[PDB]
């Protein structure tokens, strides 16, 4: 017979399969539509998720109850040290899809970037790009010819850049290499932009800007093998259920004599690649500046790093990106930040944001103070003090 009472589904059928992602770094499967009018610039960036915090900002939305009144929101902080442009690759369109035809690398590579190419760096001759380096030492023989080959073809040009993992508190010691499509114009100019940037760094402030509407692309937090009840949010069976109750009672009818692909079943949860859209940047921090957490109303010399450092991460000595909301992926994970695909007015994507105060209290518990100067001022002197 039919279902006694109609109820919506559980989970999302468009997010299958819920298997582990291919790699720890999520891959950007689409880039903003290119217009050959603006100057050549990146369309994405690489960063690391440090942690979340609490921000206080005066909401400005005509008609709303809290218009011109104070609200409290939670944002996540992403450490974004500048990346190094090492190598560009061109893509020629084919009736079978886009295909890379050539790759031109930089003459010199840092130690951290080439560690990606070795599964055992400690016992190795470290002969990476050594003979490719010999392609240089002549003016332009083997390289400029390849660059010209890219110019004559390769309607889409992407740039290979790698993070400076040594600048982060992580003990990773291995860089992350990724591609970013350039959305300037006159692809001949695109490769000129890339070649001039070989062995050169690019700061995050040259890509993203305050109040800009961006997107986050990262692999979520894995959780191993998971029961059906929590993997899909199904109803728990009654208490007096034999042979367990954290299950799904009926997984299919007699016909078809198979288990449907749309029935919730136990399997690995998390560690999937996700693309979270519509996240608004609030502050573009600069590592070469104290008082990172100081607003025009706070005016206290305190960095974005809380007391005792970010939980499980450390400090934010580098430039950082802090975006409203929460982005997928846990702390210490590589995260790729992307420009918005389409222009969105929405009267909230055009909102101008100016912060008031940053919660720098220690996240290792119910923190009370914001600065050891304040802590000493409040508690007074102690036995440890002389």
């Amino acid at each position: 017979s039919h279902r006694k009472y109609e109820a919506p589904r559980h989970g999302h059928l468009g997010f299958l399969p819920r298997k582990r992602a291919a790699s720890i770094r999520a891959r950007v499967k689409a880039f903003p539509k290119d217009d050959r009018s603006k100057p050549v610039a990146l369309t994405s960036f690489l960063g690391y998720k440090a942690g979340m915090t609490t921000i206080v900002r005066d909401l400005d939305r005509p008609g709303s109850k809290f218009h011109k009144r104070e609200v409290v929101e939670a944002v996540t902080v992403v450490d974004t040290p500048p990346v190094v442009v090492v190598g560009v690759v061109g893509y020629v369109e084919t009736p079978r899809g886009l295909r890379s035809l050539t790759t031109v690398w930089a003459e010199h590579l840092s130690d951290e970037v080439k560690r990606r190419f070795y599964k055992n760096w400690y016992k190795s001759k470290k002969k990476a790009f050594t003979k490719y380096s010999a392609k240089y030492a002549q003016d332009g023989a083997g390289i400029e010819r390849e660059l010209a080959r890219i110019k004559k073809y390769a309607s889409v040009v992407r740039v290979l850049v790698h993070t400076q993992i040594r600048k982060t508190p992580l003990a990773q010691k291995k860089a992350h290499l990724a591609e970013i499509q350039l959305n300037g114009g006159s692809i001949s100019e695109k490769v000129d932009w890339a070649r001039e940037h070989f062995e050169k760094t690019v700061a995050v402030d040259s890509v993203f800007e305050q109040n800009e509407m961006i997107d986050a692309i990262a692999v979520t937090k894995g959780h191993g093998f998971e029961g059906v009840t929590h993997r899909w949010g199904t109803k728990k069976l009654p208490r007096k259920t034999h042979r367990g109750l954290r299950k799904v009672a009926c997984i299919g009818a007699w016909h078809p004599a198979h288990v449907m692909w749309s029935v919730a079943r136990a399997g690995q949860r998390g560690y999937h690649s996700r693309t979270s859209i519509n996240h608004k940047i609030y502050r573009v921090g600069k590592g070469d500046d104290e008082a990172n957490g100081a607003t025009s109303f706070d005016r206290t010399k305190k960095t974005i790093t809380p007391m005792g450092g970010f939980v499980h991460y450390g400090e934010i000595k580098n430039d950082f990106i802090m975006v409203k909301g929460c982005i997928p992926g846990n702390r210490k994970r590589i995260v790729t930040l992307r420009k918005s695909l389409y222009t969105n007015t929405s009267r909230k994507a055009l909102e101008e944001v100016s912060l008031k105060w940053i919660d720098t209290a220690s996240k290792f518990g119910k923190g009370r103070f914001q600065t050891p100067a304040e802590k000493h001022a409040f508690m007074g002197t102690l036995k440890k003090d002389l």
């Binding site: 105060w357 919660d359 209290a361 119910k366 002197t381």
Partner: protein, 67 residues
């Protein structure tokens, strides 16, 4: 913004932190965390707890401010 003062322990309460409690007689009590809130629910006298600011002032500890 205006930083709050805890009703039980006097600790400074920053925006978005702690819990606010309104008693039936319309008096409001703000607790910086669950620790102070729970002790308040057990009718513990702030004067008898050794780390509250009220106790410290009452017992003249670190009171070198006023002469």
């Amino acid at each position: 913004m205006k930083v709050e003062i805890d009703s039980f322990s006097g600790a400074k309460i920053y925006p978005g932190r702690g819990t606010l409690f309104v008693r039936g007689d319309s008096k409001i009590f703000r607790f910086q965390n669950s620790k102070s809130a729970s002790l308040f629910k057990q009718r513990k006298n702030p004067r008898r707890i050794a780390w509250t600011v009220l106790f410290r002032k009452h017992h003249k500890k670190g009171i070198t401010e006023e002469v």
